[PDB]
Amino acid sequence: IFKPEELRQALMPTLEALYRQDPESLPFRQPVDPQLLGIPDYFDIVKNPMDLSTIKRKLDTGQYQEPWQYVDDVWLMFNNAWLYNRKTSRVYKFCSKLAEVFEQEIDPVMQSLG
Ligand SMILES: CO[C@H]1CC[C@@H](n2c([C@@H]3CCCC(=O)N3c3ccc(Br)c(Br)c3)nc3cc(-c4c(C)noc4C)ccc32)CC1
Numbered sequence: 001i002f003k004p005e006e007l008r009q010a011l012m013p014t015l016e017a018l019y020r021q022d023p024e025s026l027p028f029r030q031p032v033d034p035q036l037l038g039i040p041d042y043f044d045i046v047k048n049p050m051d052l053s054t055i056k057r058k059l060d061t062g063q064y065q066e067p068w069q070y071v072d073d074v075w076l077m078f079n080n081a082w083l084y085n086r087k088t089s090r091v092y093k094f095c096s097k098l099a100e101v102f103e104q105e106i107d108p109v110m111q112s113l114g
Pocket of ligand 1: 023024026027028030032033037039080081084085090091094
């Protein structure tokens, strides 16, 4: 079993590594707001939205019981952006950069946590 403060200690540096990507992480620091962005179909397409602020709060409150639930939420964030945004868009290419960064940062941590 994984204690929530052990998960936070291990996993939150990989999340801070994503925040440190600037400007690539800027679209991802807060939930998508389809009203502000004038994209009324966003919630038609993205049925399980996720973003860095939601993941951070879940680490902060101990809502992950297992490290793979965290990894899954980060990838859900990525997949939502790749699904909604065109492959030529800045948000799409920024998402791809974040996934490259995350894949590096998460590998030694998950090796440690197993
Ligand atoms: C203060 O909080 C702000 C609120 C919103 C802002 N926002 C912008 C803005 C507005 C439009 C003009 C522009 O050019 N924006 C822009 C700004 C910075 C960068 Br970097 C980039 Br790229 C674009 N578009 C966004 C797209 C997403 C998105 C995702 C993920 N999945 O689907 C979508 C869709 C999410 C947030 C976005 C980011 C931060």
